[PDB]
């Protein structure tokens, strides 16, 4: 009653006490600061190695840290570990759940993970002493569909699900250690910071939350989107990140500034972004629309430098290699193309 | 040396052999999404085909079907429903003997039909609990007109075949419900996908064959659409 009304006004006044601080720290803008920077111009990139062999739609992929091997997942219970240089299918892991929505390649390359509507992030050991690869273990305990599971170390994995929770696990014993709560919507994507001491998470509530891995607290929350956030990725330096939502725009938020710096919106574009990945320098942003093509944005001018028009369906998953050599791009046409 | 190259090239050939064998079984199995609500009766539908996410495996005339009951997830669908944009069909189950929650089923139908990703998937609509509908209509305590004001202005369609020795009040109740789902289906349907409504009870010795017959029809019409015949 009176007590509940006091809490609503007390919490709302804090938002009023933050928004004035946010607008106060807006003396300049990214758009006018970089008005004189030499434009990127036109970025033309053509397909180099189209990878074929997925029966069903490709839902997600991940690059190895060696910038050579990538792993892809498709809705037919197949994890194929591709060799990008030579187009050679190193492994084709058969999955118990034909419905997988994410996959991550470990930085050591010893393991790979995947999860989806099975509600479990399975870990597959690629250095088994025997011929084939098996299931290392099952990380059961989540309630919703696993939307994104990236790797911290060989023994720490961070997962986000449809139950509005990001979880950090321990593969050695398969029990959840730290649970991140605070989202009011399905969580769709993560991003690990380059220092791995933080990670930002975008959910289906137009809010991206920065989390602290070792503490298990959401230290800061970024709002300014209008619809579900479908992908998120840090800036290469780890001092900023960018998001893609269903309202057909991409927004770059600054961690230190605390507000959105610049939005990447076009009048012709009315399709939700499905995947975002920065270039190695951070000067380009690559956004994979479900308008059947990817657009290479000037990350300090909001100018479409170029378009990667080569897909016959929704662009599912997009990634850039660590060295920034080339850009893979899965899709729902079951074909994972590599651009450069 | 190029000795390692030969080993990689033969492992790719071994992989490709297994992928071809997995392609044959993947195309020979029809995947179905089994939607519905808390009281819909998908539980008793899967008991007929028994002969987190849950899969039901059955065959009719030596044709394998996969049915997925997505049960483990939350009440928000807008992001896990996009996974099933490749399924042969949606098996949608509705409780025809609960008029209060019947409007919920119509809104869910509308969102599925008009989805940017599912606008090509046909629906095998199942109106379960027809037995409970018979007794409720003859009870007279609950009125369709209480929930649906256009039931008063509705007549039993000419192209309707009542069951042997059936009360005609029930037939007019049944076919008003059916027409409510079909009314949505035809408003935006552009031949990309079709609805296949059916009247089933909890005691049917069927709905394995009905799905098989409707699945073959869905597969027939995509061929003709490719041929520009339809």
């Amino acid at each position: 009653q009176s007590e509940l009304d006091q809490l609503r006004q007390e919490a709302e006044q804090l938002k009023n006490q933050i928004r004035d601080a946010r607008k106060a720290c807006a003396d300049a803008t990214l758009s006018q600061i970089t008005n004189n920077i030499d434009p990127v111009g036109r970025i033309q990139m053509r397909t180099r190695r189209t990878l074929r062999g997925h029966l069903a739609k490709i839902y997600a992929m991940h690059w190895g840290t060696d910038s050579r091997l990538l792993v892809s997942a498709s809705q037919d219970g197949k994890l194929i570990i591709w060799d990008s240089y030579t187009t050679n299918k190193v492994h084709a892991i058969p999955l118990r759940s034909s419905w997988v929505m994410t996959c991550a390649y470990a930085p050591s390359g010893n393991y790979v993970a995947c999860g989806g509507l099975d509600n479990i992030c399975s870990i597959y050991n690629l250095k088994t002493r025997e011929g084939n690869v098996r299931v290392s273990r099952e990380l059961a305990g989540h309630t919703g569909y696993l939307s994104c599971c990236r790797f911290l170390d060989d023994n720490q994995i961070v997962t986000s699900s449809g139950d509005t929770t990001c979880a950090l696990w321990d593969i050695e014993t398969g029990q959840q250690t730290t649970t991140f709560t605070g989202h009011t919507g399905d969580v769709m994507s993560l991003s690990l910071a380059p220092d791995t001491r933080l990670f930002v998470s975008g959910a289906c509530d137009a809010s991206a939350k920065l989390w602290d891995v070792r503490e298990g607290m959401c230290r800061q929350t970024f709002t300014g989107h209008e619809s579900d956030i479908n992908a998120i990725c840090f800036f290469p330096n780890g001092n900023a990140f960018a998001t893609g939502s269903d309202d057909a725009t991409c927004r770059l938020f600054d961690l230190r500034a605390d507000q959105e710096l610049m939005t990447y919106s076009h009048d012709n574009i009315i399709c939700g972004i499905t995947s975002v990945s920065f270039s190695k320098s951070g000067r380009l942003l690559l956004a994979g629309y479900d308008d059947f093509n990817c657009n290479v944005w000037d990350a300090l001018k909001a100018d479409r430098a170029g378009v990667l028009a080569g897909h016959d369906n929704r662009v599912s998953c997009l990634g850039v290699t660590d060295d920034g050599m080339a850009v893979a791009t899965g899709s729902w046409d079951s074909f994972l193309k590599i651009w450069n | 040396q190029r000795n390692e190259e030969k080993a990689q090239r033969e492992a790719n050939k071994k992989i490709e052999k297994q992928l071809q064998k997995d392609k044959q079984v993947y195309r020979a199995t029809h995947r179905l999404l089994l939607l519905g609500a808390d009281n819909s009766g998908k539980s008793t539908i899967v008991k007929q085909m028994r002969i987190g996410i849950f899969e039901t495996k059955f065959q009719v005339d030596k044709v394998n079907f996969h049915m997925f009951d997505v049960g483990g997830q939350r009440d928000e669908r807008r992001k896990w429903i996009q996974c099933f944009n490749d399924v042969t069909a949606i098996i949608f189950v509705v409780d025809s003997s609960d008029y209060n929650r019947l409007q919920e089923a119509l809104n869910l139908f509308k969102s599925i039909w008009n989805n940017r990703w599912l606008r090509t998937i046909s629906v095998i609509l199942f109106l379960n609990k027809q037995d409970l509908l018979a007794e409720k209509v003859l009870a007279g305590k609950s009125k369709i007109e209480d929930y649906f004001p256009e039931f008063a202005r509705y007549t039993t369609p000419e192209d309707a075949t009542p069951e042997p020795g059936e009360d005609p009040r029930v037939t007019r109740a049944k076919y008003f419900i059916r027409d409510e789902f079909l009314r949505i289906s035809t408003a935006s349907g552009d031949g990309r996908h079709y609805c296949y409504p059916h009247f089933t009870c909890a005691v049917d010795t069927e709905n394995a064959r009905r799905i098989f017959n409707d699945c073959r029809d869905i597969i027939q019409r995509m061929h003709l659409r490719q041929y520009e015949l339809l």
Partner: nanobody
Framework: QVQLQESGGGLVQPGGSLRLSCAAS????????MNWVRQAPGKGLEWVSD????????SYTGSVKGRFTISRDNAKNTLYLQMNSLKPEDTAVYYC?????????????????????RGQGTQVTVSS
């Protein structure tokens, strides 16, 4: 920030009239289809009505059909629900739900328990 604040709602005699105003902020009101959903005491959320971007396509739940009137004003970013007659059965809290994706006809999860894009809502009470 996507915020939806609802006005009106209050004690009313049966067969009276009341107007609900939903003010939208932090998004282009012009693109998202809107909705009205009500939660009766000890009962799940029910869908009441929806309105398209241009107001052309309007529907209703049937239990309120031709008695509730829904209108939107893209100029002021305001969504209305004109209640003409007030049956005692419609005693519930009214939320001003917004469809998730902008340029789509489909409107999933507006009646979910924990939906993100649904306002706080105002309790509408009808009694003698």
């Amino acid at each position: 920030q996507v915020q939806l604040q609802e006005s009106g709602g209050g004690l009313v005699q049966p067969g009276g009239s009341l107007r609900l105003s939903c003010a939208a902020s932090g998004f282009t009101f012009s693109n998202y289809k809107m909705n009205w959903v009500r939660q009766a005491p000890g009962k799940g959320l029910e869908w009441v009505s929806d309105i398209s971007q241009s107001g052309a396509s309007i529907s209703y739940t049937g239990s309120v059909k031709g008695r509730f009137t829904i209108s939107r004003d893209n100029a002021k970013n305001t969504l209305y629900l004109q209640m003409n007659s007030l049956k005692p059965e419609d005693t519930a809290v009214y939320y001003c739900a917004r469809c998730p994706a902008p340029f789509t006809r489909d409107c999933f999860d507006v009646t979910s328990t924990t939906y993100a894009y649904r306002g706080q809502g105002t309790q509408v009470t009808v009694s003698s």
